[PDB]
Design a protein around this ligand. Structure first.
Ligand SMILES: Nc1nc2c(ncn2[C@@H]2O[C@H](COP(=O)(O)OP(=O)(O)OP(=O)(O)O)[C@@H](O)[C@H]2O)c(=O)[nH]1
Ligand SMILES: Nc1nc2c(ncn2[C@@H]2O[C@H](COP(=O)(O)OP(=O)(O)OP(=O)(O)O)[C@@H](O)[C@H]2O)c(=O)[nH]1
Ligand SMILES: [Mg+2]
Ligand SMILES: [Mg+2]
Lengths: 431, 438, 398
């Protein structure tokens, strides 16, 4: 029985975590009251991985929500599923970090970081054997950007033998017009490289473009992006909550998908693409899903998987497809002589097959690969980070709190070295 | 007499020990609950099965085994198995975290909070034995736990139980039946850490046994269960020298003098014949000569190699069942007239032959039939070095890009251990060829 | 107070079994010693005025205590070695009375063992140990290892260089990576007469062979040591064995121009880029050195080839390397004190790359680099190499 502690910080982080928990609860068959009412025995053989069995046969979540601002806290407390989260697992202040990374990591977010450690430690004491912590936040802001880094740096010192996985949400100028976002993203990535084993990047520009073109929505709001983020999160954590032949734990998955220490950013995806409201319209097959998992349109990041090498590939199928039918399809797409052969679907790919399908869909698929194209996500922020650094714009706010140009240049050098290593590995011999 | 304790480690190790104990109980007639109606004593000291089993005042037979695992998934099924009343609960030790295919874990991360208890349990069994010979380790190089924890226990025992023999029965990993992509690193690390902690060690190629089960036994997809039943036969044929009142390799120390001439070289090849299926039980009757000649077949060998292109240092033949020296002389003469094999002039040991008046045994409704005779040939040849060559290829290629290396250094390991382990492997490979110089 | 009350407490703290206590005590002993030396240097007074001989004996026994207990093992071995390196560097930079004692031999043996076993150290702290050991050796070889002004002890010169040249042919790539810089960081008075041998030994490593295919880190250090030796010896006519002159400048430039064409593609990727990095700076600091002494030695063909190669290297799909290439190109073009001879199309290059477009333009960003680099195609010389370099970016993977 391997348990996982889920933590949420920042407005966007909490909004994503609430939706993800609601999705994985509706898929497992858990009414919003707390009891169980599903119709499948497979929805309980691994429920202990994210739910504590309290008295009375109830399943208490393990989501530790923290937020300096008392906004999203009250909304999640009175949500469709707000009554599930323990009430002393909510840790908040009054004034946030004011879009400054040096506020939610040094002067403000380090004022509740001690209450966070007490809560995450009180939650882990009941577990029989902890596997690894988890965090869901956005690189944009101060309580998501600085608080997450502070907690990741503080927990690694007391639990070095635990896996550290995050779900960073890179912002984009299209979604937010804030100008102090490049610095918060750079400083967050600087800490998310030396104290993180895995990081699932969910760029906001990709979801914005998807909602603008694919879904054809009028004004894509935050709900449309949160729905896709929660869908991708539920599709990624399919092996850690359901049985199957590929019993890849968290540590095993991180070791098999992350050969290098610094390189650990993935490009998660999910298909088919849907929206809120209606969903039932067309039933997809295994060939169509495989053809669409590997399309740059189904990806949640502004990167072209085809343009770049393939470090490690993995896919998770959900529905009445059999690992034998999947192997037949995964052994004819890595062959040129084979018809309908693809050049971007690589070899030695990891593949899974689930029984319980997602909500509102009979068949789906999730992609969790790591391509060098992700470098584009790091360069877009580099340029915006240099043009504003030469003029020293909005730097007094950082220098007054305690930060200095030393950390800025260190983060810049780290990002440059990472981009250089990515570009160097992109040109490697296949055999 | 002298007793012995078998220390099983890993998933493969615990899966192989259960089948071995089942075969021993079926041979000696021990009931599942542990009752020998043929034994005419309550305690051990005059019989012959006391070397492996232990007697008590209540007539209960507690096998001398120390099963230790990290993942309780297999131990839970082993406890509630058919022989739940055979093994003692204290002998079965379970952990709380799996190494997840890692050596720096099974050694430093998950091997530190379990070693302090394994010794206390092994001492309880060591104090009861009046004269222990050594230890019978059962693990695999592929499994991270079975390698790291086993090496840690081995060296931990080298300090305390220093004047005791040491044996091993590893399982060489194969590319087909591969559970981890770091299999080459764990194997080259455990072979270097315990190259001095093993007096003798037995290697089982997963490819050879799979091919044997697919061809000889005629099976479509030989599962781990079928591969463990086939290895149980060889394990029993090897342990019969110490279990029964024989006259060849009766003590663990004799193995280091009649099979392991060089302390460093301790990887003797083993073969067992015949391999008849259950359907073709009374189809053909192969005499001693046929089974003795079949031992020189690469397909029937337990490891994929080519002994023809290599010299021989030590050779030991063991016959079981209806066998007479007059018939063994025919096979001995055929080995020289028909076949021909060279020998190392600098080796002290030579050829040895022994017979035991104990017929074989098979599990009811199993894969193998109740043959009338059996032969086991243990030959220490340099050809086995080839099996170590390919293993070094994969490891070398992987460490060329240092992939999955950061996961080990960040778990109580140094970057120099890999260089030391491959410097040791290179020296061993060089010595293997130097021993076979014309 | 720091010399009579604090230094004795830091001299005894080194015997602490605690690992974090020994490193701190060593660092404090080094820093306070350097501060006392700097203070005494003001009144041109010796360093023994503040520190007594009892405290002096501690600086000699600190090495013996570490060598006896064998503390250079495990995880703390690298930390102890790094601390002792800084200690020896600060002691040699203060002109201590340790010359002609077994302490110097012990320090040299420790430095050799540290530069001998480098693969055993983790990659997260290898560059620090590589740059500290060479500095400590240079400070020791530029302080204690001397017989008279302008000369050195021949007994040490006949053995150190020999052992290093016998260590530059070590199969282990990390051995050469550490020995090349150590041999190159030697002073100028310790290179008199043995400069040709050192140059030949360093060039033998820069040459590629069937066995040394993926040896990029070694070739990088080989060029770095050559550049360091060239910058240290300076220039001096009529002395090929003492400094660089017109008799061996061609052979040196040939070795620098040959490593630029290295485009190895190992399993890790395009590692050859590294070998090019040190091959660019080595071609910069050198070209300036002659410009500050004997600019007439720089030939026209060699200068044109270097310029075309830098232009090709400043138009590569890579961003971190292209930025450094453009920076080196701008530093070589704007250098006018004195102006460097053999500059192809010098007026056009100055007009296309003004001084104001050096710090304001971000070469790392393709958008702020390609529009200014594509204009070079107008010139005849900057057409073939520039186009060859841009073809890689116009049809790569990014
Ligand atoms: N996808 C998505 N992005 C969001 C959401 N909320 C905010 N963001 C983005 O995240 C950034 C703002 O960070 P927030 O999470 O609002 O801030 P915070 O972490 O609470 O920090 P403070 O502003 O200091 O209080 C901007 O780039 C927003 O576009 C959300 O619900 N979904
Ligand atoms: N012959 C045989 N090989 C086995 C058996 N179980 C596993 N293996 C092989 O051993 C290797 C994996 O070792 P395991 O025993 O699963 O590993 P472990 O000791 O449990 O340690 P972990 O790495 O933590 O799982 C692979 O090469 C498997 O194919 C078994 O019962 N018999
Ligand atoms: Mg907020
Ligand atoms: Mg296991």
């Amino acid at each position: 029985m391997r348990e996982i502690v889920h933590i949420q910080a920042g407005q966007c982080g909490n909004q994503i975590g609430a939706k993800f928990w609601e999705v994985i609860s509706d898929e497992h068959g858990i009414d919003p009251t707390g009891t169980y009412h599903g119709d499948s025995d497979l929805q309980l053989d691994r429920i202990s991985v994210y739910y504590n069995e309290a008295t009375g046969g109830k399943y208490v979540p393990r989501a530790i929500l923290v937020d300096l601002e008392p906004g999203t806290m009250d909304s999640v407390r009175s949500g469709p599923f707000g009554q599930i989260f323990r009430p002393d697992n909510f840790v908040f202040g009054q004034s946030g970090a004011g879009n400054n990374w040096a506020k939610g990591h040094y002067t403000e977010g380090a004022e509740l970081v001690d209450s966070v450690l007490d809560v995450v430690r009180k939650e882990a004491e009941s577990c029989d054997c902890l596997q690894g912590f988890q965090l869901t936040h956005s690189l944009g802001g101060g309580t998501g950007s600085g608080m997450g880094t502070l907690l990741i740096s503080k927990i690694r010192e007391e639990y070095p033998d635990r896996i550290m996985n995050t779900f960073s949400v890179v912002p984009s100028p299209k979604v937010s017009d804030t100008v102090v976002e490049p610095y918060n993203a750079t400083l967050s990535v600087h800490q998310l490289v030396e104290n993180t084993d895995e990081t699932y990047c969910i760029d906001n520009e990709a979801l914005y473009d998807i909602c603008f073109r694919t879904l054809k929505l009028t004004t894509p709001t935050y709900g449309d992006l949160n729905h896709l983020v929660s869908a991708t999160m539920s599709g990624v954590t399919t092996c850690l909550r359901f049985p199957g032949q590929l019993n890849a734990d968290l540590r095993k998955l991180a070791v098999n998908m992350v050969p290098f220490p610094r390189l650990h950013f993935f490009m998660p995806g999910f298909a088919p693409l849907t929206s809120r409201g209606s969903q039932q319209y067309r039933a997809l097959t295994v060939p169509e899903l495989t053809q669409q998992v590997f399309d740059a349109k189904n990806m949640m990041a502004a990167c072209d998987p085809r343009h770049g090498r393939y470090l490690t590939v993995a896919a998770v199928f959900r529905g009445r497809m059999s690992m034998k039918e999947v192997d037949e399809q995964m052994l004819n797409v890595q062959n040129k002589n084979s018809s309908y052969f693809v050049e971007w679907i690589p070899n030695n790919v990891k593949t899974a097959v689930c029984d319980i399908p997602p909500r509102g869909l009979k068949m789906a698929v999730t992609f969790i690969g790591n391509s060098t194209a992700i470098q584009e996500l790091f360069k877009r922020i580099s340029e915006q980070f240099t043009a504003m650094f030469r003029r020293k714009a909005f730097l007094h706010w950082y220098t007054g709190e305690g930060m200095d140009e030393m950390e800025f240049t260190e983060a810049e050098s780290n990002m440059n070295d990472l981009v250089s290593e990515y570009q160097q590995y992109q040109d490697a011999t296949a055999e | 007499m002298r007793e012995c304790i078998s220390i099983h480690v890993g998933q493969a190790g615990v899966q192989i020990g259960n089948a071995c104990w089942e075969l021993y109980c079926l041979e000696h007639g021990i009931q599942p609950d542990g009752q020998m109606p043929s034994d005419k004593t309550i305690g051990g000291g005059d019989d012959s099965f006391n070397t492996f089993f232990s007697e008590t005042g209540a007539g209960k037979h507690v096998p001398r085994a120390v099963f230790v695992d990290l993942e309780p998934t297999v131990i839970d099924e082993v406890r509630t198995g058919t022989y739940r009343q055979l093994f003692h609960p204290e002998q079965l030790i379970t952990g709380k975290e799996d190494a997840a295919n890692n050596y720096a874990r099974g050694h430093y991360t998950i091997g530190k909070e379990i070693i302090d208890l394994v010794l206390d349990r092994i001492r309880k069994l060591a104090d009861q034995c009046t004269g222990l010979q050594g230890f019978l380790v059962f693990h695999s190089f592929g499994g991270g736990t079975g390698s790291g924890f086993t090496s840690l226990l081995m060296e931990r025992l080298s300090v305390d139980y220093g004047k005791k023999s040491k044996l091993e029965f590893s399982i060489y990993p194969a590319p087909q039946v591969s559970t981890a992509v770091v299999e080459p690193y764990n194997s080259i690390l455990t072979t270097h850490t315990t190259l001095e902690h093993s007096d003798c060690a037995f290697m089982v190629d997963n490819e050879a046994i799979y091919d044997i089960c697919r061809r000889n036994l005629d099976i479509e997809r030989p599962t781990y269960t079928n591969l463990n039943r086939l290895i149980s036969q060889i394990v029993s044929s090897i342990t019969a020298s110490l279990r029964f009142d024989g006259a060849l390799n009766v003590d663990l120390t004799e193995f280091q003098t009649n099979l392991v001439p060089y302390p460093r070289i301790h990887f003797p090849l083993a073969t067992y014949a015949p391999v008849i299926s259950a359907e073709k039980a009374y189809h053909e009757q192969l005499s001693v000569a046929e089974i003795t000649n079949a031992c020189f077949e690469p397909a029937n060998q337990m490891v994929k190699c080519d002994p023809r292109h290599g010299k021989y240092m030590a050779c030991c033949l063991l016959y079981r069942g209806d066998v007479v020296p007059k018939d063994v002389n025919a096979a001995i003469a055929t080995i020289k007239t028909k076949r021909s094999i060279q020998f190392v002039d600098w080796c002290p040991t030579g050829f040895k032959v022994g017979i035991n008046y104990q017929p074989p045994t098979v599990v009811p409704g199993g894969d193998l039939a109740k043959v009338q005779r059996a032969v086991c040939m243990l030959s220490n040849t340099t050809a086995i070095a080839e099996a170590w060559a390919r293993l070094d290829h994969k490891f070398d290629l992987m460490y060329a890009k240092r992939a999955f290396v950061h996961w080990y250094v960040g778990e109580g390991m140094e970057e120099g251990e890999f260089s030391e382990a491959r410097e040791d492997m290179a020296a061993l490979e060089k010595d293997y060829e130097e021993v076979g110089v014309d | 107070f720091s010399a009579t009350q604090v230094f004795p407490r830091l001299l005894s703290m080194t015997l602490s079994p605690d690992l974090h206590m020994r490193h701190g005590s060593i660092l404090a002993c080094a820093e306070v010693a350097y501060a006392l030396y700097k203070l005494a240097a003001q009144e041109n007074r010796p360093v023994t005025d503040h520190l007594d001989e009892q405290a002096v004996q501690g600086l000699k026994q600190i090495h013996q205590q570490l060598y006896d207990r064998q503390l250079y093992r495990g995880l703390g071995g690298q930390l102890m070695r790094q601390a002792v390196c800084v200690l020896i560097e600060k002691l040699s930079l203060s002109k201590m009375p340790f010359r002609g004692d077994t302490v110097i031999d012990g320090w040299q043996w420790l430095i050799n063992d540290t530069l001998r076993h480098l693969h055993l150290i983790s990659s997260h702290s290898r560059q620090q140990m590589k740059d500290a050991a060479v500095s400590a050796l240079a400070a020791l070889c530029s302080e204690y290892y001397m017989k008279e002004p302008g000369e050195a002890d021949p007994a040490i010169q006949e053995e150190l260089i020999t052992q290093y040249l016998a260590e530059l042919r070590n199969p282990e790539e990390m051995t050469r990576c550490g020995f090349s810089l150590a041999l190159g960081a030697l002073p100028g008075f310790l290179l008199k007469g043995r400069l040709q041998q050192v140059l030949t030994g360093l060039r033998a490593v820069t040459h590629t062979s069937p066995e040394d295919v993926s040896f990029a880190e070694s070739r990088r250090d080989g060029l770095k040591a050559i550049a360091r030796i060239c910058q240290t010896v300076g220039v001096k006519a009529g002395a090929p064995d003492e400094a660089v002159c017109g008799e061996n400048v061609s052979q040196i430039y040939c070795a620098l121009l040959g490593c630029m064409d290295d485009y190895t593609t190992d399993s890790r990727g395009d590692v050859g880029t590294w070998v090019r990095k040190a091959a660019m700076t080595s071609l910069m600091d050198l070209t300036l050195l002659l410009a500050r002494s004997q600019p007439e030695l720089i030939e026209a063909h060699t200068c044109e080839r270097i310029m075309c190669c830098v232009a090709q290297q400043a138009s590569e799909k890579i961003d971190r390397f292209r930025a450094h290439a453009a920076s080196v190109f701008l530093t070589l073009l704007h250098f006018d004190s004195p102006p460097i001879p053999h500059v192809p199309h010098r007026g056009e290059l100055e007009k296309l790359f003004p001084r104001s477009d050096v710090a304001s333009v971000n070469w790392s960003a393709p958008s702020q680099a390609f529009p200014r680099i594509t204009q070079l195609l107008g010139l005849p010389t900057y057409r073939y190499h520039v186009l060859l370099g841009l073809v890689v970016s116009l049809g790569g993977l990014t």
